Amino acid sequence: SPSFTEDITLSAVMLQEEDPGEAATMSMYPDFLKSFLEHPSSAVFELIEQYEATCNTQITLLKKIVKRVTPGQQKFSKTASILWLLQQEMVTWRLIAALYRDRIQSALEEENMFEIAAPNASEKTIVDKLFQRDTLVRQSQLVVDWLESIAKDEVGDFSDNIEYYAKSVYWENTLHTLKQRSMLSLGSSRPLVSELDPDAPIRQKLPLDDLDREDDIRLLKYLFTLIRAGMTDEAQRLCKRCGQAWRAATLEGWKLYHDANINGGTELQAVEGNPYRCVWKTCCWRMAEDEQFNKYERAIYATLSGNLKQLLPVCESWEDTVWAHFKVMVDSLVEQEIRASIISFNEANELPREYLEANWTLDSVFEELQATDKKRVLEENREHYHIIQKFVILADVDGLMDEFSEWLSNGKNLLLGHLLRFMTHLLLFFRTLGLQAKEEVSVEVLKTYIQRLINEKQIELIAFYVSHLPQELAISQYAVFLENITDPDQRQRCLELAKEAGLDVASITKTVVENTRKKDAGEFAHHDFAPALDSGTSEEDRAKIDVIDWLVFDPAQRAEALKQSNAIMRKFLASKKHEAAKEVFAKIPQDSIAEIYSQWEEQAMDSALPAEDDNAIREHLCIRAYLESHEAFNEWFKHINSPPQKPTLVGQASFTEKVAHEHKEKKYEMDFGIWKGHLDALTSDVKEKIYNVLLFVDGGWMVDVREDTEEDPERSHQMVLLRRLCLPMMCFLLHTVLHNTKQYKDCLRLADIVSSENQKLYTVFSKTEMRNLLQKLRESSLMLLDLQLD
Amino acid sequence: ISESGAPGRSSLDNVEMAYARQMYMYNEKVVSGHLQPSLVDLCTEAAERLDDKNVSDLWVMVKQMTDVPLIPASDTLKSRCSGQMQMAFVRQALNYLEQSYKNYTLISVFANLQQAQLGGVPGTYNLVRSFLNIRLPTPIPGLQDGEIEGYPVWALIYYCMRCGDLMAAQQVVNRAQHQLGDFKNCFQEYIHNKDRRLSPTTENKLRLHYRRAVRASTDPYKRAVYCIIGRCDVSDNHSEVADKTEDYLWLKLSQVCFEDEANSSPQDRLTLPQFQKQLFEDYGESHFAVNQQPYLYFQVLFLTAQFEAAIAFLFRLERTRCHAVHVALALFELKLLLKSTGQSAQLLSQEPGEPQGVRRLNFIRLLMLYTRKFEPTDPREALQYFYFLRNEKDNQGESMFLRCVSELVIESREFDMLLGKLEKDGSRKPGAIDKFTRDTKTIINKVASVAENKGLFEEAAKLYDLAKNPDKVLELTNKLLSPVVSQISAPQSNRERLKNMALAIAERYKSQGVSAEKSINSTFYLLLDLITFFDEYHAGHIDLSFDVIERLKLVPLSQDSVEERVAAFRNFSDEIRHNLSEILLATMNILFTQYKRLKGSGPTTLGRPQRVQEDKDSVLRSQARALITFAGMIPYRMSGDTNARLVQMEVLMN
Amino acid sequence: CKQLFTDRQRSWWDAVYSLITKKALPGTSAKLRSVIQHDLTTLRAQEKHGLQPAVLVNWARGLHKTGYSLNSFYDQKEYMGRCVHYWKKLLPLLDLVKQKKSIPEPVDPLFKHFHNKDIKVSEVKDLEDEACIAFATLDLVDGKTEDAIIAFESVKNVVAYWNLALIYQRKA
Incomplete structure (x- = not known):
C-alpha cells in the first residue's frame, strides 16, 4: 500500500512526534485472529508461514516508524524496546516450530535397531550411521544450522552494501615505497619487506604500513561477518573482487572426501577434503594454545579447535557460546566413540583423562551457562526471553510452572498483551500436540487473556476466544462482559458474533438476570411490606427496569421472559411500585401466554410439559385483573372529583346561559352513560373472576398447579400470604367499584358479604388496609343511601 | 519536555519565573494606563541578567532581527500573501546575516587575541586583514595582478563581501591601485550602488568573461568574487561545504533575487519555496549533521522565512518547548501566527497551494495541548496565561478563555484569596484576577451556574454568597433540598447535615441583608416549615407534628377555608406542587397513628373521656372534609395510589 | 421518473418542510429541531463534517452557476461566503483524492455510490483555482x-x- 510509504516518507522529514504504535497494536489482533481462524492446527506449516509473513510485515512497519526519527524520547525508546521484543518473540516462534518439526520427525523413528557395526572408508559414512543412533547430536546440529540461519538473516543486505566501497588494488603504498627504494636508494628507512605476499611479513616477523594493517583488519572483519552468517559464495566473490583470496583458500582443509563414486559415469565429488584432519586439528590446537594474534583469528582458531580454556573469553554472545559448547561436546563424543572402538594411538585433540572419561549430556550446557562467572552472562541469564528460550529448549515442566507462578505472583510488570497472546497460542499448540499443564495455571492464563482482551476492547475478538474456556467459567465471564453492553448496533453485532461462534447468549443473559436478582436479594420477598417512615423507590429498581432491555432484545425465550417479568412485577408490588408496574404492563403485550403456548406446541415437545406455563397464565391473569381494578378505581375517583354528571345549579338567568346549561346537561348525560356502561362491563368481568376465589379459604392469586415449577417453597408461601391478604382487599375493591354503576342487583349482597366466609381470624390480613377499605365501602353505601338505596 | 505547572508551590524554572514576573508587571502597567515600552526588551534584559548565555544570545539575535522597520502584519496568511514585506524581510535577513558574520569575525579576533600571528587591529579593514591572516596568510594558488602587503586580494575582497563592510571594501579598492586590473571602478560602483547598478553592458561583459575564462582556477575566493560580480547561475560552490553553510546561504541570497534588477534574466534567480525545500530536505535534521547544533538550524530557519518550521524545531527539542511557547506568545503580541481550528490534528497543518516551512499553525490545538499538559498551577502563571487567552474573541459559543477558566476553577475548587474571602456571608474582595479584569460578578455568576449544571452544591452556594445573589442562593437551596424531601430526613448520612448548614447559611444571609423576592421568601418559609414538620415526625413525635401542622395555617382546615386554600394554590410553584405528595403522605401517616392510638385508648376507661373522643372525631371529620374538597376541586391530579390513600384517610377521619 | 436517489434525502426534506410549516408534533418538536439543526450544521460544514468531495464540488458548481448568472451585490457576497x-x-x-487513495465516503449512503468516485486527476487544477478565487473574494470582503x-x-x-470585472463595473 502506498499510504504506508507516503506516511513514513513524510514522517522521516516532518518535525512532529506521532506514535502509531498503539494503532498497530490494536490492528494486529484482528489480523492475527483472522489468520488463526483461516489456518487451523492441522496445516501447521502454512499457519506458521502466514504468521511469519504477517509478523515480518508488522516488524517492518514498526522499524520504519522507529527509524523515522531519532529514538530519544521515552515513547520511541519503549517503541524500539517493543520492536526488539517482537523480533525475539518471532525468533522464539521459529525455534518452537523447528522443535515441533523435529519432534514430529522423531516420533516416527523413536525405536531403532542395531546390527551393523563394521567400519569402512571415509568417516562421513560412520557419521551418517551414528546420526540415526542418537538424537542428541541431531538436535545439536539442528540448533547450529538454526543459529547460522539467524546470522544469515541478521546480516541483511551487507552483500550489496559492500559494493558501495569495495576496493580492487592493494599494496599500493608498499609497491610505491619499494619502487622508490629501488630507483633512488631512499624511501625505506624502516624495517622493510622483501616480497609482496600476504604471508611474507608474517613470516619475516617484520610488519609495514599501519594503514595497510588497518585495511587488512577491516577486510578480515568483513570476512568474519560473511563467514559467521554461513556464506561462502559472497565470501569468494569479495575475495576475487579485492585480492585477498588466501583466507578463502586456507579455510578449506577441515573437510572430508565424499566416497560414493563407484564407476566412471558418476561425477567426481570425492575431491574436497583431506585425510589429514587429525594433524590439521592438532596444529589448530597448537595455534589456539600459542594464540597471540588478533581477536578474529583467535576466535576462528578456537572454533576450529575446541579449547574451552581460551574459548571462554572468545565467546562474544550467548549464541556463539552455546554453539561452541555444542560443537565441542559433539566432537568430543564422536571422536571418543570412533577412536576407543577402533584405534587410539594418536590423540588428534589433546584431551586429558578428565575429558576422555566423561560422557557429556544436555544438562551440563545449562549448568555451565548458569555457572558463567561473567557479569554480562549472569545478568542475561536472569531476564525473561533468555529463560523462555532455555525452557523451550529443555522442554521442562516443573521449573517452567514454578517460574510462571513467580511471574503471576509478581504481576503484569513484565508481560504484555502480545506476550500473553503468544503464550496462549503456544499453550494451545502444546495441548493440541501432546500432554498438558495444570488446571490452576490454565484457568489463570485464560482469565488473564480475557482480561487483556476486555481491556483492549474490540468486541469482534472476545467471542472467538471465550469458547476456548471451560463452559462454566466462559459463561461466568461472558456474563460480566455482556453486563456492560449498549447501542442496538453493537448489541446486534455481538449477537451475530455469538451466534457464529456458537455461544448461548440467551442463557448468558438469563444467568445475568439471575445473578442480578440474587445480588439484589429481592424486594420485600413476595408480600406487601410497607416501607418505614417516608422513602422513595429502591435503588435496585433502576437496574431491574434497565435489565429488561437486553432481555427483550432477543425474542426467543418468551417463557423465561414472562417468568422474570412476573417475578419483577411481584417484587414491585411488594416494594410499592404500581406506576412502574403499569408502565411495564403497557409496554409488554397481552398475548404473552398465547405466544408462550404457541411456541410450546410448535417446538414439538409436549411429553415434558411442566406447570410453569399454567403458573405464568395464572400470574398474568391475576396481574391484569388487579391492574384493571386499580384503573377502574382511579377512574371512578376522578369522575367523583369531576361533576357527577348532574344538573348542578351554577346561575341561570339568560337565553345563552340556559342554552349552555342544556348543552352541559346533554354532555353530562352522554358521559354518564358511557361511564356506567364501561364500568359495568369491567366490574362484571372482575366479579366473574372473583366469584371463583370467594369459595376458597386462603386466597387464589399467583397460585401453583402441581410440582416442578420455577417458584421456590419460600416464594410459594410468600405468594400464598399475598393472595390471602389480597382476597378480602380485592373483593372489597370490587364491591367499592360496583356502587355508582346504578346497578345494585349484584351489590345488594354487601350487607351480608362482610361476615360471610372467614374461618381465619383477622391477624395477618393487614388491619390497616382492610379497615380503610371497609370504611370506603361504608362511605359508598352512605352515598347510595343519599342517592336513594338501602 | 517543558516547564509544566507544578501543583501549588514547588520549584519551577528561573526563566519562566522571570517571564511571568515581567508579564505581571506588564499587566499592572496596562491596568494603570501608562503606555508600556516593549516586553521584548524586558525579556532581553532578563536573559542577560540570568546566568544562561546561549539562549540569551539567541533571544538577543531574535530581538535585533525583529527590531527591523517592518509593518506589523495580522496573520501568517497575510504575511505570505503580501509580497513587499516578504522581500523586505529577506533583505533584512541578508543584512543581519552579514552583521552576524561580522560579529563572528569579531569573536574569532577576540579569541585569537593580539600577539598571535598578527592579531586583530582596531578598524574594520584592519580586522578583516587580521582575520584573513589568521585563516590563510599564505598566498593561495591562482593569484592575479599584485597583492596588498603580501595578502591575497581576492580572499580579502571575499571576506569584506561576507562581512558586509562596504567602507572597508572601498578602502581596500583605494589601496589596490596597481595591484589589480581595470575593474577597480567597477568594484567601486558595485560597492556604492545599493541596488547594484554597474552598467548592464559591463555586467554582461563580466558574466561572459566569467563563463569563458574564470571557470577552473585554483582560487575559490576569486572564483566566488567574480561569480558574485557577474551574476551567474543561482548557486556556485567551491569549498564551502564543510559545516559552514552560512557562506553558502549568503552566496545563494546574493545571487538569487525575487525582483528583477540589473542584469536580471532566467537561470539567474530562484524562489523562496526552493530554498525552503533545500533547507528542509537536504539540510534538514539527521541529514547534514545539524542535530548537534540546533541553534544554527533555528537561525537559518528564521532567516529563510520559516517561522512555523522554526517553532516546530524548537518544540521538538528537549527543555525547549517553554522557549517555543515564549517566542510564540511574543509573536502573538507582535501580531503574527495565523489562527487555525482543530483540536485533535497535528500542530503543522497546510492547505493545497502552500509551500513547506510556511504552514498554518493550529493555535487551537496548541492551546488545547498547553492546557492539557498542565496541572493545578500557581495563580500568577494562571493569570499570565489568561491575559493571552482573553485576546481571542468568541468561537462557536462562549469563548475558549471562558471554558479554560471554568475548567480550571472547577478542577481547583479554591477562591478564598483568588476571588474573595468570606467570614460567614460577606461580600466579594478584590482578588488577583479582580485586580486586573472587570466583570468579576458576572464571571463568578457564570462559573457558579456552570458548577450547578455540572453537579456542585456547597461550593456553588459559597460562590453565589460571595457574589451576593440571594435569588440564586435560594433557588439552588430549594433545588438541592427538593429531591431529599422525598426520601427520609433522619440523621443517617451527610446530606441532612449539608442541607442543615445550607439552610443556616441562607437564613443568616437573609437576616443580614436584603433577601430574595416575595414568592421566593414565601417558598423558603414553606420549605422550612415542611422540613421542620418532617424531622419532627421522623423523630418519633406525633403531638408536636400535629400542633406545628395546625399552627402552619396553610393546610385545608374547613370548607370555608378550602376556598382560600385553592385561591392560594394558584400562586405556588413546581416544587410546592410536587412536594404535596410527601406532605399528604406524612399527614395521613400522622393522622392514622393518632386514630390508632385513639382506638387503642378506651372510650370510657384508660382515660380520654367520651366528650373528648367525640370532639376529636368531629375535628377529624372537618379536616378530612376540607382535605377531600381541596383535592377534589384543585386543577391537579397525580396517581392512583396517592388518590386511594387520600380517600382512605378521608374516610378514616370520616 | 420518481426517486432517483436515496430515501434519506426525501425524509430530510419532508422533515424540514414539516418543521417550517408547523406540520409536525409539539411533543417531538424538540428532537425534530435538534435533528434539523444537526443536519444543517453538517451541510454547512462549519463544526461537523462528513460529506463527499463529489457532492462538495457539485455544491460549488451550483453556487457559481446561481451567483455569476445574475448581477447583484449582497447576494453575490453571500454566495461567495458559502x-x-x-x-x-x-x-x-x-x-x-490526488494520491489515488480511498474516497472518503460516509457511513450513511446519501446517493447512489456508483458514479461519485473522485480519483481522476483532471479538474483538480480548476478546483484549486476556484478555491483560490473564493479565498481572494473573502479577503476582499474582509478588506484585503x-x-x-x-x-x-x-x-x-x-x-x-x-468576478473582478463585475466588481470593477459595480465600483465604477
Missing part, C-alpha cells in the same frame, strides 16, 4: 484588496477575472 465555507473543508478532502488582487494575478481562471 463557496469559501465549503472550500475550506473541501480542500482537505481534495488533498486525499492587495492580497486578493495578488492571488487573482497569480492564479489563471476565467471565474476570477469575471
Whole structure:
C-alpha cells in the first residue's frame, strides 16, 4: 500500500512526534485472529508461514516508524524496546516450530535397531550411521544450522552494501615505497619487506604500513561477518573482487572426501577434503594454545579447535557460546566413540583423562551457562526471553510452572498483551500436540487473556476466544462482559458474533438476570411490606427496569421472559411500585401466554410439559385483573372529583346561559352513560373472576398447579400470604367499584358479604388496609343511601 | 519536555519565573494606563541578567532581527500573501546575516587575541586583514595582478563581501591601485550602488568573461568574487561545504533575487519555496549533521522565512518547548501566527497551494495541548496565561478563555484569596484576577451556574454568597433540598447535615441583608416549615407534628377555608406542587397513628373521656372534609395510589 | 421518473418542510429541531463534517452557476461566503483524492455510490483555482484588496477575472 510509504516518507522529514504504535497494536489482533481462524492446527506449516509473513510485515512497519526519527524520547525508546521484543518473540516462534518439526520427525523413528557395526572408508559414512543412533547430536546440529540461519538473516543486505566501497588494488603504498627504494636508494628507512605476499611479513616477523594493517583488519572483519552468517559464495566473490583470496583458500582443509563414486559415469565429488584432519586439528590446537594474534583469528582458531580454556573469553554472545559448547561436546563424543572402538594411538585433540572419561549430556550446557562467572552472562541469564528460550529448549515442566507462578505472583510488570497472546497460542499448540499443564495455571492464563482482551476492547475478538474456556467459567465471564453492553448496533453485532461462534447468549443473559436478582436479594420477598417512615423507590429498581432491555432484545425465550417479568412485577408490588408496574404492563403485550403456548406446541415437545406455563397464565391473569381494578378505581375517583354528571345549579338567568346549561346537561348525560356502561362491563368481568376465589379459604392469586415449577417453597408461601391478604382487599375493591354503576342487583349482597366466609381470624390480613377499605365501602353505601338505596 | 505547572508551590524554572514576573508587571502597567515600552526588551534584559548565555544570545539575535522597520502584519496568511514585506524581510535577513558574520569575525579576533600571528587591529579593514591572516596568510594558488602587503586580494575582497563592510571594501579598492586590473571602478560602483547598478553592458561583459575564462582556477575566493560580480547561475560552490553553510546561504541570497534588477534574466534567480525545500530536505535534521547544533538550524530557519518550521524545531527539542511557547506568545503580541481550528490534528497543518516551512499553525490545538499538559498551577502563571487567552474573541459559543477558566476553577475548587474571602456571608474582595479584569460578578455568576449544571452544591452556594445573589442562593437551596424531601430526613448520612448548614447559611444571609423576592421568601418559609414538620415526625413525635401542622395555617382546615386554600394554590410553584405528595403522605401517616392510638385508648376507661373522643372525631371529620374538597376541586391530579390513600384517610377521619 | 436517489434525502426534506410549516408534533418538536439543526450544521460544514468531495464540488458548481448568472451585490457576497465555507473543508478532502487513495465516503449512503468516485486527476487544477478565487473574494470582503488582487494575478481562471470585472463595473 502506498499510504504506508507516503506516511513514513513524510514522517522521516516532518518535525512532529506521532506514535502509531498503539494503532498497530490494536490492528494486529484482528489480523492475527483472522489468520488463526483461516489456518487451523492441522496445516501447521502454512499457519506458521502466514504468521511469519504477517509478523515480518508488522516488524517492518514498526522499524520504519522507529527509524523515522531519532529514538530519544521515552515513547520511541519503549517503541524500539517493543520492536526488539517482537523480533525475539518471532525468533522464539521459529525455534518452537523447528522443535515441533523435529519432534514430529522423531516420533516416527523413536525405536531403532542395531546390527551393523563394521567400519569402512571415509568417516562421513560412520557419521551418517551414528546420526540415526542418537538424537542428541541431531538436535545439536539442528540448533547450529538454526543459529547460522539467524546470522544469515541478521546480516541483511551487507552483500550489496559492500559494493558501495569495495576496493580492487592493494599494496599500493608498499609497491610505491619499494619502487622508490629501488630507483633512488631512499624511501625505506624502516624495517622493510622483501616480497609482496600476504604471508611474507608474517613470516619475516617484520610488519609495514599501519594503514595497510588497518585495511587488512577491516577486510578480515568483513570476512568474519560473511563467514559467521554461513556464506561462502559472497565470501569468494569479495575475495576475487579485492585480492585477498588466501583466507578463502586456507579455510578449506577441515573437510572430508565424499566416497560414493563407484564407476566412471558418476561425477567426481570425492575431491574436497583431506585425510589429514587429525594433524590439521592438532596444529589448530597448537595455534589456539600459542594464540597471540588478533581477536578474529583467535576466535576462528578456537572454533576450529575446541579449547574451552581460551574459548571462554572468545565467546562474544550467548549464541556463539552455546554453539561452541555444542560443537565441542559433539566432537568430543564422536571422536571418543570412533577412536576407543577402533584405534587410539594418536590423540588428534589433546584431551586429558578428565575429558576422555566423561560422557557429556544436555544438562551440563545449562549448568555451565548458569555457572558463567561473567557479569554480562549472569545478568542475561536472569531476564525473561533468555529463560523462555532455555525452557523451550529443555522442554521442562516443573521449573517452567514454578517460574510462571513467580511471574503471576509478581504481576503484569513484565508481560504484555502480545506476550500473553503468544503464550496462549503456544499453550494451545502444546495441548493440541501432546500432554498438558495444570488446571490452576490454565484457568489463570485464560482469565488473564480475557482480561487483556476486555481491556483492549474490540468486541469482534472476545467471542472467538471465550469458547476456548471451560463452559462454566466462559459463561461466568461472558456474563460480566455482556453486563456492560449498549447501542442496538453493537448489541446486534455481538449477537451475530455469538451466534457464529456458537455461544448461548440467551442463557448468558438469563444467568445475568439471575445473578442480578440474587445480588439484589429481592424486594420485600413476595408480600406487601410497607416501607418505614417516608422513602422513595429502591435503588435496585433502576437496574431491574434497565435489565429488561437486553432481555427483550432477543425474542426467543418468551417463557423465561414472562417468568422474570412476573417475578419483577411481584417484587414491585411488594416494594410499592404500581406506576412502574403499569408502565411495564403497557409496554409488554397481552398475548404473552398465547405466544408462550404457541411456541410450546410448535417446538414439538409436549411429553415434558411442566406447570410453569399454567403458573405464568395464572400470574398474568391475576396481574391484569388487579391492574384493571386499580384503573377502574382511579377512574371512578376522578369522575367523583369531576361533576357527577348532574344538573348542578351554577346561575341561570339568560337565553345563552340556559342554552349552555342544556348543552352541559346533554354532555353530562352522554358521559354518564358511557361511564356506567364501561364500568359495568369491567366490574362484571372482575366479579366473574372473583366469584371463583370467594369459595376458597386462603386466597387464589399467583397460585401453583402441581410440582416442578420455577417458584421456590419460600416464594410459594410468600405468594400464598399475598393472595390471602389480597382476597378480602380485592373483593372489597370490587364491591367499592360496583356502587355508582346504578346497578345494585349484584351489590345488594354487601350487607351480608362482610361476615360471610372467614374461618381465619383477622391477624395477618393487614388491619390497616382492610379497615380503610371497609370504611370506603361504608362511605359508598352512605352515598347510595343519599342517592336513594338501602 | 517543558516547564509544566507544578501543583501549588514547588520549584519551577528561573526563566519562566522571570517571564511571568515581567508579564505581571506588564499587566499592572496596562491596568494603570501608562503606555508600556516593549516586553521584548524586558525579556532581553532578563536573559542577560540570568546566568544562561546561549539562549540569551539567541533571544538577543531574535530581538535585533525583529527590531527591523517592518509593518506589523495580522496573520501568517497575510504575511505570505503580501509580497513587499516578504522581500523586505529577506533583505533584512541578508543584512543581519552579514552583521552576524561580522560579529563572528569579531569573536574569532577576540579569541585569537593580539600577539598571535598578527592579531586583530582596531578598524574594520584592519580586522578583516587580521582575520584573513589568521585563516590563510599564505598566498593561495591562482593569484592575479599584485597583492596588498603580501595578502591575497581576492580572499580579502571575499571576506569584506561576507562581512558586509562596504567602507572597508572601498578602502581596500583605494589601496589596490596597481595591484589589480581595470575593474577597480567597477568594484567601486558595485560597492556604492545599493541596488547594484554597474552598467548592464559591463555586467554582461563580466558574466561572459566569467563563463569563458574564470571557470577552473585554483582560487575559490576569486572564483566566488567574480561569480558574485557577474551574476551567474543561482548557486556556485567551491569549498564551502564543510559545516559552514552560512557562506553558502549568503552566496545563494546574493545571487538569487525575487525582483528583477540589473542584469536580471532566467537561470539567474530562484524562489523562496526552493530554498525552503533545500533547507528542509537536504539540510534538514539527521541529514547534514545539524542535530548537534540546533541553534544554527533555528537561525537559518528564521532567516529563510520559516517561522512555523522554526517553532516546530524548537518544540521538538528537549527543555525547549517553554522557549517555543515564549517566542510564540511574543509573536502573538507582535501580531503574527495565523489562527487555525482543530483540536485533535497535528500542530503543522497546510492547505493545497502552500509551500513547506510556511504552514498554518493550529493555535487551537496548541492551546488545547498547553492546557492539557498542565496541572493545578500557581495563580500568577494562571493569570499570565489568561491575559493571552482573553485576546481571542468568541468561537462557536462562549469563548475558549471562558471554558479554560471554568475548567480550571472547577478542577481547583479554591477562591478564598483568588476571588474573595468570606467570614460567614460577606461580600466579594478584590482578588488577583479582580485586580486586573472587570466583570468579576458576572464571571463568578457564570462559573457558579456552570458548577450547578455540572453537579456542585456547597461550593456553588459559597460562590453565589460571595457574589451576593440571594435569588440564586435560594433557588439552588430549594433545588438541592427538593429531591431529599422525598426520601427520609433522619440523621443517617451527610446530606441532612449539608442541607442543615445550607439552610443556616441562607437564613443568616437573609437576616443580614436584603433577601430574595416575595414568592421566593414565601417558598423558603414553606420549605422550612415542611422540613421542620418532617424531622419532627421522623423523630418519633406525633403531638408536636400535629400542633406545628395546625399552627402552619396553610393546610385545608374547613370548607370555608378550602376556598382560600385553592385561591392560594394558584400562586405556588413546581416544587410546592410536587412536594404535596410527601406532605399528604406524612399527614395521613400522622393522622392514622393518632386514630390508632385513639382506638387503642378506651372510650370510657384508660382515660380520654367520651366528650373528648367525640370532639376529636368531629375535628377529624372537618379536616378530612376540607382535605377531600381541596383535592377534589384543585386543577391537579397525580396517581392512583396517592388518590386511594387520600380517600382512605378521608374516610378514616370520616 | 420518481426517486432517483436515496430515501434519506426525501425524509430530510419532508422533515424540514414539516418543521417550517408547523406540520409536525409539539411533543417531538424538540428532537425534530435538534435533528434539523444537526443536519444543517453538517451541510454547512462549519463544526461537523462528513460529506463527499463529489457532492462538495457539485455544491460549488451550483453556487457559481446561481451567483455569476445574475448581477447583484449582497447576494453575490453571500454566495461567495458559502463557496469559501465549503472550500475550506473541501480542500482537505481534495488533498486525499490526488494520491489515488480511498474516497472518503460516509457511513450513511446519501446517493447512489456508483458514479461519485473522485480519483481522476483532471479538474483538480480548476478546483484549486476556484478555491483560490473564493479565498481572494473573502479577503476582499474582509478588506484585503492587495492580497486578493495578488492571488487573482497569480492564479489563471476565467471565474476570477469575471468576478473582478463585475466588481470593477459595480465600483465604477
